[PDB]
């Protein structure tokens, strides 16, 4: 396992969002990408179980306004430190938005906006730096 490119990560982020939005058949994804996607969804599920074991409210009263605030959330989340656990939290926030805020089972224009924002943040912040992947 090692660092991957921004190019690869842009692909991986979109496949991650389409998968959790249920707008890409497992079939239709490149195998290796489907591996990395599943790896990130599994980390997010683990991260969500710890959140849920400590806190009763879900993310849905802060993230209903992801529209103007998402980039603010993302920046606080990395202010004090960058590590892979903060990255997994970043992805679970994006998974929450797809799965409960945005219109379900669809690749709407807001999904594309979520994509851009996450992709623009992951890259501009060099998150690839703190999260290696298989092979």
């Amino acid at each position: 396992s090692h660092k991957k490119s921004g190019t690869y990560w842009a692909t991986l982020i979109t496949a991650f969002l389409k998968t959790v939005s249920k707008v890409e058949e497992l079939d239709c994804v490149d195998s290796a990408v489907l591996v990395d996607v599943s790896k990130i969804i599994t980390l997010t599920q683990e991260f969500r179980r710890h959140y849920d074991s400590v806190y009763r409210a879900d993310y849905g009263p802060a993230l209903k306004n992801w529209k103007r605030d998402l980039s603010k959330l993302f920046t606080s989340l990395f202010v004090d430190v960058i590590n892979s656990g903060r990255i997994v939290g970043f992805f679970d926030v994006g998974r929450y938005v797809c799965e409960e805020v945005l219109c379900p089972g669809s690749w709407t224009e807001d999904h594309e906006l979520l994509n851009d924002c996450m992709t623009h943040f992951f890259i501009e912040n060099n998150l690839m730096n703190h999260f290696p992947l298989e092979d």
Binding site: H50, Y55, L73, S76, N83, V88, G89
Partner: peptide, 20 residues
């Protein structure tokens, strides 16, 4: 609300990353 979310996510990151 949002700053509060942030705080809770960092707590969660600390538990997830408890020691690694």
């Amino acid at each position: 609300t949002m700053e509060n979310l942030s705080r809770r996510l960092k707590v969660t990151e600390a538990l997830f990353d408890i020691m690694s």
